[PDB]
Amino acid sequence: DAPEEEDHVLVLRKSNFAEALAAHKYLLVEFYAPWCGHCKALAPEYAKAAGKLKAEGSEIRLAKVDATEESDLAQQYGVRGYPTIKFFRNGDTASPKEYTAGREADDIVNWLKKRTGPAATTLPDGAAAESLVESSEVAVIGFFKDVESDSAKQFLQAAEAIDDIPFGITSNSDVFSKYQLDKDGVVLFKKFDEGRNNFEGEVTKENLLDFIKHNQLPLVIEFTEQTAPKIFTHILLFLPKSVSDYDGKLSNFKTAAESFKGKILFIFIDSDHTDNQRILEFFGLKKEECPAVRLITMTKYKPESEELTAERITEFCHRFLEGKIKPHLMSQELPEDWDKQPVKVLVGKNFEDVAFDEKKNVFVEFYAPWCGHCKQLAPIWDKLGETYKDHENIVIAKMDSTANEVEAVKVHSFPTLKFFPASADRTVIDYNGERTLDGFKKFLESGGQDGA
């Protein structure tokens, strides 16, 4: 008990950090920089909280790290500013919970108290049992008459290894009978699908974690943009609520999900809704084009037929699982005029065979319409086309890089002028020279070796 510390707050270097991780099962670490104004204000409140845990005889220890002094210890935790407070259970560096609440001593303390102590809540009666289940979407309850058995201990070891799910443990046999159990066992409760799964086999940590990993998550899941992080190989069903046989088609989307669990994540989204737009335009779809299906992995794919049984949606997945389905690239409809004017219009389908034509010197303007800089350049580009309208090898082109995506080259800033020489090796050269007709002409005739 003679370790470096300030006001009951452990001073952590990179030399002792993992030593305090093991010597303290509940370690709250504040990452601060001595110049940070907000780290200054938290400092006496952070220590005030450490003294109050001390007075209660709490085992929870509060520590801090001077990011200017270690620097590599802030790098090793993806720290993105100061103060940064991370909570470590069981010295596990894999799942540190970030503290994001109030920075007064009483806030910090009440936050710790609600997530310290053993990970499995002891259940004496059916009240605490069914409360634990109702308190979360997914809950796991272990049933052990002898709580000292390895099965019980391996269960508690598995409970500590998971934080996203509440764990319960009981020895009361009124509970066993209540939940239809005559012997020891583990039951996973969920508010979806079958609603309940029972564990089978040797009750070990490894087998328990695997049992939970595969039994959480619904078969098909409702898509919300707040769930997008945790959710994201996925198959996305854009299903409107207004449609007929909604339940029937949803059923077909679930039975197909039964054959790909753990490999493909089945997600259905309500297209009729107003919050599923960022994603419905991310795939370049409209409510009218739905019901629709889009599989991804960023590689995205798209089914052949447009109908939604179980067999076709399944084989579609199988077709993707072996090539047999080409990546779907976003691309406009290639207007038949596209090449009937001095400036040839490009889209996603022709691009490669146009731009990378081995007998052509293609000059493409990647653009967008609201881009004032790409409308200040529009008259100069049409003049460049008219100048080279009857040229033999030179072709002047333009593509809307919004509604089109191409694998060959990427563009996200407009306007971007790229030149594709007439060669076999698919060479590309950027034009960063004077945006003038004189500059364009000086650059083309000179092969591209002079300019930019």
Side-chain angles (χ1 to χ4, degrees), residues 111-343:
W111 184 85
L112 294 171
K113 281 180 181 180
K114 291 176 177 294
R115 62 178 56 237
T116 52
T121 295
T122 281
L123 311 170
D125 46 336
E130 79 187 35
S131 174
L132 184 141
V133 181
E134 188 71 16
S135 73
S136 183
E137 272 220 67
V138 172
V140 175
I141 302 184
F143 298 74
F144 305 99
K145 194 201 176 188
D146 199 16
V147 80
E148 254 67 34
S149 57
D150 323 345
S151 304
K153 299 302 179 180
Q154 286 298 285
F155 173 77
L156 300 187
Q157 283 288 126
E160 297 289 335
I162 294 187
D163 186 15
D164 25 326
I165 302 180
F167 286 83
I169 181 173
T170 192
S171 60
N172 192 31
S173 51
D174 289 345
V175 179
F176 282 58
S177 310
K178 186 182 178 229
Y179 285 102
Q180 295 295 100
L181 254 173
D182 52 342
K183 183 180 68 65
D184 286 22
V186 181
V187 182
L188 190 146
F189 301 88
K190 63 182 138 181
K191 293 179 179 179
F192 44 85
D193 310 331
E194 53 261 36
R196 177 183 311 204
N197 289 306
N198 297 268
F199 181 77
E200 306 164 355
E202 196 187 12
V203 199
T204 83
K205 185 188 176 190
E206 296 82 359
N207 304 346
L208 280 172
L209 294 190
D210 294 331
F211 165 79
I212 299 172
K213 298 268 200 65
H214 291 310
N215 295 143
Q216 54 185 8
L217 277 54
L219 208 51
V220 307
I221 78 186
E222 273 218 343
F223 174 82
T224 95
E225 194 155 287
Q226 59 154 58
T227 21
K230 53 159 172 180
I231 294 163
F232 307 96
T233 299
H234 301 245
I235 178 178
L236 277 62
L237 175 64
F238 298 86
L239 181 59
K241 296 264 181 87
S242 178
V243 87
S244 46
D245 209 27
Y246 169 93
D247 277 333
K249 303 183 189 307
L250 179 72
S251 163
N252 296 162
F253 190 68
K254 294 187 182 185
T255 317
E258 292 174 3
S259 309
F260 298 94
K261 179 62 173 171
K263 212 177 210 301
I264 298 92
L265 206 63
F266 279 65
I267 313 151
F268 79 104
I269 115 170
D270 185 24
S271 40
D272 286 335
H273 202 252
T274 65
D275 212 9
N276 307 318
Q277 298 301 327
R278 176 194 178 262
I279 192 73
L280 187 134
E281 192 80 339
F282 183 73
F283 287 79
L285 299 153
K286 310 180 202 300
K287 297 162 56 192
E288 321 92 56
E289 300 166 347
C290 295
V293 177
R294 298 292 174 267
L295 199 156
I296 66 173
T297 287
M298 28 217 88
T299 329
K300 68 198 137 47
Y301 304 179
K302 168 187 68 172
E304 330 275 38
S305 60
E306 295 302 320
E307 61 187 37
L308 308 168
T309 55
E311 187 253 334
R312 304 227 168 174
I313 297 185
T314 303
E315 110 181 351
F316 157 53
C317 294
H318 286 312
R319 270 149 164 262
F320 126 82
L321 279 171
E322 61 213 31
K324 197 159 175 193
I325 286 194
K326 290 178 92 86
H328 168 209
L329 279 307
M330 183 66 75
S331 180
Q332 294 161 296
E333 50 202 43
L334 172 71
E336 304 182 53
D337 186 274
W338 71 277
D339 65 330
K340 293 164 69 179
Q341 247 118 235
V343 153

Side-chain angles (χ1 to χ4, degrees), residues 73-120:
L73 199 47
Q75 299 261 23
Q76 294 260 304
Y77 287 91
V79 169
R80 6 139 159 255
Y82 312 101
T84 292
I85 320 184
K86 289 240 151 58
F87 182 62
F88 296 97
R89 291 201 55 148
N90 297 305
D92 184 1
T93 63
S95 298
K97 180 66 192 307
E98 200 172 331
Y99 177 76
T100 299
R103 295 178 188 174
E104 183 218 320
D106 265 341
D107 283 354
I108 302 181
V109 174
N110 295 337
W111 184 85
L112 294 171
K113 281 180 181 180
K114 291 176 177 294
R115 62 178 56 237
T116 52

Side-chain angles (χ1 to χ4, degrees), residues 44 77 100 160 197 227 240 257 335 345 354 363 390 395 406 422-423:
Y77 287 91
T100 299
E160 297 289 335
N197 289 306
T227 21
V345 157
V354 182
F363 202 10
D390 300 288
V395 280
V406 63
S423 69

